[PDB]
């Protein structure tokens, strides 16, 4: 036969993956179905532009919430492609593609600045961005070695100091590989915004933690104790608005997570050249999901 055998290579775009919006909608459903606020205040506007605060009061039961691993499976008629290329930056064509019935097991965590309990890179650290040139595009950092962070809930979480320092070190190197070897890398704390954005915030065991992460993002070419506090009144992530959750059930609340990634932003401007500044980012949970689904692409079977 003259016919030739060929592997089927598809094009990927982790930035325009419908699996992300789908998961985002699923996470939101699972939450409202298990952790709803006692009072929810959300802005309600009309055409002209006049708005009024909407207040919703409902039962807000609290129960020990344990991580339920989930994954996405292909419905009859479609298949889930998986890019297995090394250092896959998340876009363009993939040479070594495979198929799976469902995605790997995921333990979805809502957080900002740091990605917790996610998947690690097999080779070295990899940084991905929809457009590095654009300083308005978030940079997702996928570590290849997790860093344990334990919160004794006693108002502070602890991390290895040299291990976190080694992490910034390797991350900075990867940034040089993407912006220039002679450029100087510098990490600075958030420039501001809501507390969830300014601090490293995450939900653990159904509680909303806010940790001061200044000691973590102050660097330039033992343990690290971060001051953290639990809040009942916060800003929602599922939608714009404020909410109030019930006080903690258990007496002492602890939390042990693996730092598998980070969300950064680079300071733009043509000012002060030769150096790049990166601060902790995040806020749009879609990027949190995207950090786990970047290697998948659902395509119609044919």
């Amino acid at each position: 036969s003259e016919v030739k055998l060929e592997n089927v290579t598809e094009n990927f775009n982790m930035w325009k993956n419908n699996m992300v919006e789908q998961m985002h909608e699923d996470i939101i459903s699972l939450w409202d179905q298990s952790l709803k606020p006692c009072v929810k205040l959300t802005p309600l506007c009309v055409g002209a532009g006049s708005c009024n605060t909407s207040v919703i009061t409902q039962a807000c039961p609290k129960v020990s919430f344990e991580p339920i691993p989930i994954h996405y499976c292909a419905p009859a008629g479609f298949a889930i492609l998986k890019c297995n290329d090394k250092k896959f930056n998340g876009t363009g064509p993939c040479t070594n593609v495979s198929t799976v019935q469902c995605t790997h097991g995921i333990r979805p965590v809502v957080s900002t600045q740091l990605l917790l309990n996610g998947s690690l890179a097999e080779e070295e650290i990899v940084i991905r961005s929809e457009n590095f040139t654009n300083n308005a595009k978030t940079i997702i950092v996928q570590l290849n070695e997790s860093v344990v962070i334990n919160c004794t809930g006693a108002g502070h979480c602890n991390l290895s100091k040299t291990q976190w320092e080694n992490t910034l070190e390797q991350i900075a190197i990867k940034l040089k590989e993407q912006f220039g070897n002679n450029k100087t890398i510098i990490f600075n704390p958030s420039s501001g915004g809501d507390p969830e954005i300014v601090t490293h915030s995450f939900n653990c065991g159904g509680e909303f933690f806010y940790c001061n992460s200044t000691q973590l993002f102050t660097w330039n070419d033992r343990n690290i104790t971060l001051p953290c506090r639990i809040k009942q009144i916060i800003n929602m992530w599922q939608e714009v608005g404020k909410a109030m959750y019930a006080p903690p059930i258990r007496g002492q609340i602890r939390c042990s997570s693996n730092i598998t990634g980070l969300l950064l932003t680079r300071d733009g401007g043509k000012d002060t050249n030769g150096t790049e500044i990166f601060r902790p980012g995040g806020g749009d949970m879609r990027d949190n999901w995207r950090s786990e689904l970047y290697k998948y692409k659902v395509v119609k079977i044919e």
Binding site: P43, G192, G193, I197, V240, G281, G282, D284
Partner: peptide, 27 residues
Amino acid sequence: XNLHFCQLRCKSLGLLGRCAXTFCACX
């Protein structure tokens, strides 16, 4: 996200305000 309110607050600090999903972030 509340862009309008976000922009004003960050602005009163010489920063630009923009949404970060449902949150306000100063740049």
